[PDB]
Structure 1
Amino acid sequence: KSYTNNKGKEVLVLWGVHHPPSVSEQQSLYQNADAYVSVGSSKYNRRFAPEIAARPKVRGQAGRMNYYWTLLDQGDTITFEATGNLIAPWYAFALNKGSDSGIITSDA
């Protein structure tokens, strides 16, 4: 699935890649023991493969998930192409400018 922008502003796109802990779980969730996802644009290009391994539980889950983000430009497109693990984006953000901001940790 692809997408082009036309907003005239940069678009901030997020996605994720799941990978289960057991081969039976991979078989159960996606029917395909081999898998990959692949993301392409003009200046971004990566192919991801899942990995299946045993690891201790956190929040009662043994799987893991990785999160990624990319700034598009005006004009240029983006293409997702996947066969086993895509956590597809469902909303995104169009960004303005105006500098000199930040993050504050305070309790006032």
Structure 2
Amino acid sequence: LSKSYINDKGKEVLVLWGIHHPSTSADQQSLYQNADTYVFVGGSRYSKKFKPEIAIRPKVRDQEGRMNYYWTLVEPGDKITFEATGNLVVPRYAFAMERNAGSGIIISD
């Protein structure tokens, strides 16, 4: 897999994606067909290579696998590249945004 996006929105773009870690080698091949896979995400400032970690975890919401969630902010005019042979939960919707001077979060009824 190889997909790229260039920020032409004039503002920062928040991009989120996930990495899937199956519970069994059977589960890996039933979803992605390839046994030894990697994910790479690269920007002008971000660069990380992900390697799926296959093992059976205690069931949480009936899932023995796990999925890790990642985010990055793409500056205007920059490119973000996705590359994978499996296990990549791709972005579909991203968010063009302009941050303020930080407010906070209120947890209340």
Could you tell me the TM-score, scaled by structure 1's length?
Answer: 0.94
Structure index of larger Rg: 1
Task: Report the equivalent of 1:4.
Answer: 6
Q: How many pairs are equivalent?
A: 107
Task: Report the equivalent of 2:15.
Answer: 13
Task: Report the equivalent of 1:39.
Answer: 41
Instruction: Give the root-mean-square deviation of aligned CA atoms.
Output: 1.0
Question: Kindly, what percent of the aligned residue pairs are identical?
Answer: 69
Deviation, structure 1 residue 19: 1.0
1:105 aligns to 2:107 (yes or no): yes
1:23 to 17, 25, 32: 25
Question: Normalized per residue, which structure has more strand?
Answer: 2
Aligned residue for 1:105, secondary structure, equals coil
Following TM superposition, where does structure 1 have runs of at least 4 consecutive aligned residues deviating by more than 3 angstroms?
none
Task: Report the equivalent of 2:68.
Answer: 66
Unpaired runs of 5+ residues, structure 2, are none
- CA 1:100–1:61: 2 relative to 1, 3 Å: closer
Deviation, structure 1 residue 99: 2.2
Cα distance in 2 for partners of 1:100, 1:31 equals: 45
What CA deviation, in whole Å up to 9, does each residue of 1:37-67 have, x standing for no partner? 1001111001101011122111111010000
Partner letter of residue 45 of structure 1?
S
Unpaired runs of 5+ residues, structure 1, are none
Deviation, structure 1 residue 91: 0.4
Could you tell me the TM-score, scaled by structure 2's length?
Answer: 0.93
